[PDB]
């Protein structure tokens, strides 16, 4: 299902889905890889 690419938004993280960037909540996304603090991390929705 849809793959997200979130970073901290400067509880909620600023994501991208595949050229549009959508803002999400920490709880409804699920880490696919190790989360990185400064840069981006790839998540996937709790819906799948």
């Amino acid at each position, epitope marked *: 299902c849809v793959t997200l690419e979130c970073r901290q938004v400067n509880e909620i993280k600023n994501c991208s889905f595949n050229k549009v960037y959508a803002l999400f909540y920490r709880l409804d996304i699920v*880490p*696919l*890889e*190790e*989360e*990185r*603090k*400064g840069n981006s991390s*790839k998540y996937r929705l709790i819906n799948c």
Partner: antibody
Amino acid sequence: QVQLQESGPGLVKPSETLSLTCAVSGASISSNYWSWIRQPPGKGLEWIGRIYDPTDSTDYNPSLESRATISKDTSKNHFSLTLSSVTAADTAVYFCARGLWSGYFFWFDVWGPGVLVTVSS
Amino acid sequence: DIQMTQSPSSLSASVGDSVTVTCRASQGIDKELSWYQQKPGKAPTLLIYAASSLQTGVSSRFSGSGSGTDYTLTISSLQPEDVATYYCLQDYATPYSFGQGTKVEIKR
């Protein structure tokens, strides 16, 4: 039960390419981080790089200057490293290790025994 | 890069003494820190992985503390099996950087 084993020539002529492989048992390379770490004789630990299959991702320590390559072989469940244009600075004991993760957290929970690779003519 | 500095370089203590290894980062690393034990001739083995959380099978004598930049490994009752060099590692940001080691030996 989960164990790792580095294999490869312990001698590399300089300016040539080190090659090692880590055979993995009791776990599948498909689900965690698999990295290489080296340790020159009587000195500390340097992380080389990791590989990860859920997102098909490799990271490399910039200290290797793009001489390092990490290959995965899901077929035989072993992953390999190559290091090109080696110099004596690449003489070290090379560890493969499995890296677990949770949230922002990461660690090497099991290590191979390690193989020494002398770079010499 | 994040520089990682352990102190001291070396230490000797009596069996049953308490010993603490310090590891200091050059930035705050939000407890993304793991401690490893490397007995001579062996590969390192994991002790602690999220500043505080002790790995299963590791002895209750090993404890992990710290926040921000400053982090400690404390050996409650130094046993003779603890002869090793101990390594901290930060996973806050790649490239993940190891401490320079702290060698622990027994005063007997």
